């Protein structure tokens, strides 16, 4: 029993992290086979970031200006290519610790583990969600660019995120592994606005089910509601609307606990309009939205991986 | 910027987890060199746990009744010994992935990472603290016994905890790697009482400093206080008393932020006696006590490990 914000075991990712330097700048890279993936602004100085012309900047660099380091062994850059906002540094030796991997672009509301790195060396791992406004509220210091987010499907590692920038508002933006930014952000040091951030309603409902599984039952109310009335309340509190796809996803949770998805919504509606009044759920005074329905099933059933 | 409950990278521990079976029972073991460490109640059935005589139980077993599995490769038990509540299963081949490691017994209030495992296979990693009453509020399902807690001092892994039991109150108890239980618990299925659980005051103060470092400043009050007056307030809210050793530990945080340790206590005292009134600190509506002063320095300075 019990519930925790669990991250994926990081060992398969640790062996893939390398240190990349172009000039003075040092950030992290992902060493898969004979290619190193890293943010393209490694070729920039602090001056270039205010208005970079990446095409012109990269042309002044050559394969010899890139120093990719893995521990105390140095890799030789045999070729470089720019794919969107990511740089593909081809080297001569394939990574012996290359795992079965996949590149995926996740949707807002999905969760993943971030392996925070500095100078190519792991420092810690934590679980987070992609906000509906395509940002992440992580912990990134200077030099942590190039740290990757990932999920683990048993034996296959699914890389979904590479960190690029901290916005002036202190939130973090990045790309998929093809270099396409999540959200309307560009890799340039200018004021960039993220959208209004909403609460991931389907995630909150799955967390309420986890509370029921682990003994927290006081919020189970005496009312019910419909999928049109609840969304009316949800919109007022900046909650994202619930669809029938979300109801279908919560099905196994409803079957395991005996509480209908619509019934749990009425419980949440009362929580929204009347607060929690000094009481906690699973040790929290706030409604939690960084657990997906799949995360709850994984932790409550104890699925393992390679 | 930003703050997260970060766990240590788990790769060095993943290569040490094996599956141990004696009869029907299956739990996890720690494969270091040519010894496998696992809870001694692996030799028990569900019936034996109500009143086990471990000496008599182990005598009926022999080296051939232990099946230690690592992935799809099986280890041969060449010898067994019982040290307190842990079983030392000596095998024939040393673990090639054995890291530089240490056995440590931590104190209450210290933090560590748990690698939750089932059937010898990793499932997830999370950070937690040893409560003052020597329990941990983790996430352990059936078969997760033998999962280990650890810290990483750059290149050396410090194993400090092995999970043994879930108390009837849903909290979790375990031992050090020499098999000595944390707290007054025995490995037997009987009603066992943990002490009153208090809040780790020095941890809360370090977290307040982290809030100041990351921009949360509203709680900085206009009063001050002394180390005898604050403990008077702390005792009323089940907060553990602050000593001069705790003040010395918070020194670098005070120097980095310019706020005296005694001044921050007066801020906390007001938070205790008057609440937080619908406001949050670092995204939390509750006062957090599972960050040590060392954790805050590590995350705010970005220290890395082997």
Curated annotation (Swiss-Prot), chains A, B:
It comes from the Viruses. There is a cross-link at residues 5, 90 (Glycyl lysine isopeptide (Lys-Gly) (interchain with G-Cter in ubiquitin)). Changing residue 49 to A: Does not affect ability to cleave and inactivate human TRMT1. Residues 1-306 form the Peptidase C30 domain. It catalyses: TSAVLQ-|-SGFRK-NH2 and SGVTFQ-|-GKFKK the two peptides corresponding to the two self-cleavage sites of the SARS 3C-like proteinase are the two most reactive peptide substrates. The enzyme exhibits a strong preference for substrates containing Gln at P1 position and Leu at P2 position. Residues 1-306 are cytoplasmic. It is found in: Host cytoplasm; Host Golgi apparatus; Host nucleus. Inhibited by pyridone-containing alpha-ketoamides compounds 13a and 13b. In turn, alpha-ketoamide 13b (tert-butyl (1-((S)-1-(((S)-4-(benzylamino)-3,4-dioxo-1-((S)-2-oxopyrrolidin-3-yl)butan-2-yl)amino)-3-cyclopropyl-1-oxopropan-2-yl)-2-oxo-1,2-dihydropyridin-3-yl)carbamate) inhibits SARS-CoV-2 replication in human lung cells. Inhibited ex vivo by michael acceptor inhibitor N3. Inhibited ex vivo by compound 11a and 11b. Changing residue 205 to V: In strain: Zeta/P.2. The active site is at 41 (for 3cl-pro activity), 145 (for 3cl-pro activity). Cleaves the C-terminus of replicase polyprotein at 11 sites. Recognizes substrates containing the core sequence [ILMVF]-Q-|-[SGACN]. Cleaves and inactivates human TRMT1, preventing tRNA guanine(26)-dimethylation of tRNAs. May cleave human NLRP1 in lung epithelial cells, thereby activating the NLRP1 inflammasome pathway. May cleave human GSDMD, triggering alternative GSDME-mediated epithelial cell death upon activation of the NLRP1 inflammasome, which may enhance the release interleukins 1B, 6, 16 and 18. Also able to bind an ADP-ribose-1''-phosphate (ADRP). 3CL-PRO exists as monomer and homodimer. Only the homodimer shows catalytic activity. Interacts with host FBXO22; this interaction promotes the proteasomal degradation of nsp5. This is 3C-like proteinase nsp5. It comes from Severe acute respiratory syndrome coronavirus 2 (2019-nCoV). The chain holds residues 3264 to 3569 of 4405 of the full protein.
